[PDB]
Assembly symmetry: C2
Homo-oligomer: 301 residues x 2
């Protein structure tokens, strides 16, 4: 049957009815600014959830992905760095008491995205891999021997906050806003104005990728440096986890061809053949839908 998947986010909140083949029906995008500025975030899980089950009375399950830390028993929302609300909330118990005929499940949103790729992606059922979602923040989810990796205390693989060889965190080096700021820094150093990016009104990963495709030396060098940084953090993840299947998602993944060569180079430079001989670096094809699909996927398990 149809399952309601919810992907809770910092800028937008997403609802969708998921089919067993991974199709999203009646995709509704809200919020988050509009939700916080008004009746509140929790008042807005109950209002928009209630409106969905009324429309689809056959729905028996609701899976929700959360953009932060969740409790080990998967009943509470600990903290969201983009949404200061929801602390120690037994959401599974309160929704089960309200809707006793419906089964509820919660998980971290980056972990949901890995589960989404595992059930519905172009590498579905791949047993052991990491999904790196390279956006404004760096999110990650890991499947290990066909099971979602949650870590010792339930909130594992927070790789965006790992320290780099520069001392700064991974997401403060490769996150979308930091990539744009670094590109502007390199354009400022380009005193001869050789680069073609100087014309554009507002930089974005897509624009920097489009100019790299044309052969712009500056745009290609930016993605090559981003690639080395991602590769250096993947060396550390691989040494700790012993996995060598990598899926790359998020807004920056559109520039896959321009940053993956240096990413692969960094991995070959620092890792022995034990890891690199059968290593795979693929593109995450579900894009921004993986989180919602994975959230619904919780109910399927």
């Amino acid at each position: 049957g149809m399952i309601l998947g919810i992907d809770v986010g910092g800028t937008s909140v997403k609802f969708g009815l998921v089919t067993p083949e991974g199709e999203i029906q009646n995709a509704t995008r809200f919020m988050t600014a509009d939700w916080v500025n008004g009746i509140g975030f929790v008042e807005s899980m109950k209002l928009e959830i209630g409106n969905f089950l009324k429309q689809y009375p056959i729905v028996k399950g609701v899976g929700i992905g959360w953009p932060g830390l969740v409790s080990l028993d998967r009943t509470k929302v600990i903290l969201l760095p983009n949404i200061p609300s929801v602390v120690n909330v037994p959401i599974v118990e309160i929704l089960r008491s309200e809707f006793p005929h419906i089964h509820f499940k919660i998980e971290n949103d980056a972990k949901c995205a890995a589960l989404g790729e595992y059930y519905f992606g172009e590498n579905k059922r791949m047993q052991t891999f990491i999904l790196l979602a390279l956006g404004t923040g760096v999110g990650s989810g890991v499947m290990m021997n066909g099971k979602l990796f949650i870590g010792g205390r339930g909130n594992g693989t927070e790789v965006g906050h790992m320290l780099t060889t520069r001392g700064k965190s991974l997401e403060n080096q490769v996150g979308i806003n930091h990539l744009i700021a670094y590109t502007h820094e390199q354009l400022a150093l380009d005193v001869a104005k050789k680069s073609s990016l100087h014309t554009i009104a507002e930089l974005s990963p897509k624009v920097i990728a489009d100019h790299a495709a044309q052969g712009d030396a500056l745009a290609l060098a930016v993605w090559a440096d981003i690639g080395t940084i991602i590769g250096e953090s993947l060396v550390n993840i691989v040494r700790v986890m012993d996995l060598n299947n990598i899926l790359l998602g998020g807004g920056i993944s559109g520039a896959f061809d321009y940053f993956v060569p240096n990413l692969k180079k960094a991995m070959l430079e620092h890792l022995p053949t034990y890891y690199t001989d059968d290593m795979y670096i693929g593109k995450a094809t579900l894009e921004n839908d993986a989180g919602l699909l994975g959230a619904a996927g919780l109910i399927m398990e």
Copy 2:
């Protein structure tokens, strides 16, 4: 009953009969230089193993820890960076065919040391922790929810080879020989000859710790820098694994009081309270016996 534990090492090979209370009887130390230079390493698992079962006919199990990569099925020894021999060897099948009345088990030696601490240490049965063995090389083993963490492909937690904020690997920064070389570099910079370490013929972790205990500014600063480096790598391990119980072993752990303050400081600086509020940093008390105890521990499971 009594179990034979074997801890295979680069400089010395160790044999011992382990009791259910964790006592080692008839501890025999060999080799490794003498083993390689002669009849060979494998000829020397068979000669010294055979001599042990003849002495103890009631022994029904043999657990062996290996100083490198082992196959996922735990039958083969892939590679040892200190011993160039033993590649794709089905050691469990060949010992089972030779001794069908005895059960055989193999594992990575750093993982064995964590299992040793889990069954017989001062924090025995602690469900989720990392054991960092700080010696010539940096070894690590992790227990997760009371089960040995092996990683996706069977050779997880090779943390000694993680990249630091300096770009070099963790063990090339804090390994015993690198600690001694760094101490000599700081003594060379000490043009006023203020330090007390200038007198000693040969530096060692114990000597640098003994001078730090006396209040030597240089010796204290060396351990403080080592502490920051270990703490920075633990930030990355904790972000990936979500564990916060840490046991510190090896030759360098004797200087626990001098490097742990900066280690803890680095962890508090880079990790939120979710990890640090109930974090524990303890001393591994089994020392060099953990590997052998853990190897025997494989048979107990």
